[PDB]
């Protein structure tokens, strides 16, 4: 049946998601709720513990932290790219369109997955090796002390929806296959794939969250919310590059931030 195939697609995406992302939400919440049997994360809550953690896990702390997020972003972009290549039809799209979809979609995916590693008090870093408190992150000097608050605010609300990794795999796939990204050469094939992905997400939510009224509509809205988060992040970057010199940006990020 058409529905049966939508479930096979959902499962395919989930399996692909597990192969592409080393730290899943399931494992992450286990660490955050204190249920894991693995090594507990080293907590970074102040300048002194940041120093200690810098050995467990020249530039000022504020820049070191900001650049640390950038480096994790570089790693995330590569994981997301590997995941994208597993979405049925993606590798057969015009190659420049694949680039475009990733260029304009990766941060939205990064912030979606980041939420999986966050709670109201902090965020897991380096695949669960550390936990950096939210308070410490906003205690950074200007403009770095506001860097992540918008992401924590988004995550608390997003996590309240209680999605699991199976829901997320499809949610992420839908966002990557956005036919409205600037400069796409062939929108139709992208839209046809996304339409099928949206049907799969709808069915996934109806089956996995039967009592969660209007969850699908809520997720469509979160997709819009994520674009606003990226917009603000991009603006804060410009503000940073406009006052923070000597700061080198990873070439992969320079490519993504260019004309964006």
């Amino acid at each position: 049946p058409e529905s049966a195939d939508l479930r096979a697609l959902a499962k395919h995406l989930y399996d692909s998601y597990i192969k592409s992302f080393p730290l899943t939400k399931a494992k992450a919440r286990a660490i955050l709720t204190g249920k894991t049997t693995d090594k507990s994360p080293f907590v970074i809550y102040d300048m002194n513990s940041l120093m200690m953690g810098e050995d467990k896990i020249s530039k000022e702390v504020a820049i070191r932290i900001f650049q640390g997020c950038q480096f994790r972003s570089v790693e995330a972009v590569q994981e997301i790219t590997e995941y994208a290549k597993s979405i049925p039809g993606f590798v057969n799209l015009d190659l420049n369109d694949q680039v475009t979809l990733l260029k304009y979609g990766v941060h939205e995916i990064i912030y979606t997955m980041l939420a999986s590693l966050m709670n109201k008090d902090g965020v897991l870093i380096s695949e669960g090796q550390g936990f950096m408190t939210r308070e410490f992150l906003k205690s950074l000097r200007k403009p770095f002390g506001d860097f992540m608050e918008p992401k924590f605010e988004f995550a608390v609300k997003f996590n309240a929806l209680e999605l699991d990794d199976s829901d997320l795999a499809i949610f992420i796939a839908v966002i990557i296959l956005s036919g409205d990204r600037p400069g796409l050469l062939n929108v139709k094939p992208i839209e046809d794939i996304q339409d099928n992905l949206l049907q799969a997400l709808e069915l996934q939510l109806k089956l996995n969250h039967p009592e969660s009224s209007q969850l699908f509509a809520k997720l469509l809205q979160k997709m819009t919310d994520l674009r606003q988060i990226v917009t603000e992040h991009v603006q804060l970057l410009q503000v940073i590059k406009k006052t923070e010199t000597d700061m080198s940006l990873h070439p992969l990020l320079q490519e993504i931030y260019k004309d964006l």
């Binding site: 790219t81 190659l95 680039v99 990733l102 070439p251």
Partner: peptide
């Protein structure tokens, strides 16, 4: 581009 290179590697 770098993204193109990542996309091409099997």
């Amino acid at each position: 581009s770098l993204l193109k290179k990542l996309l091409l590697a099997p």
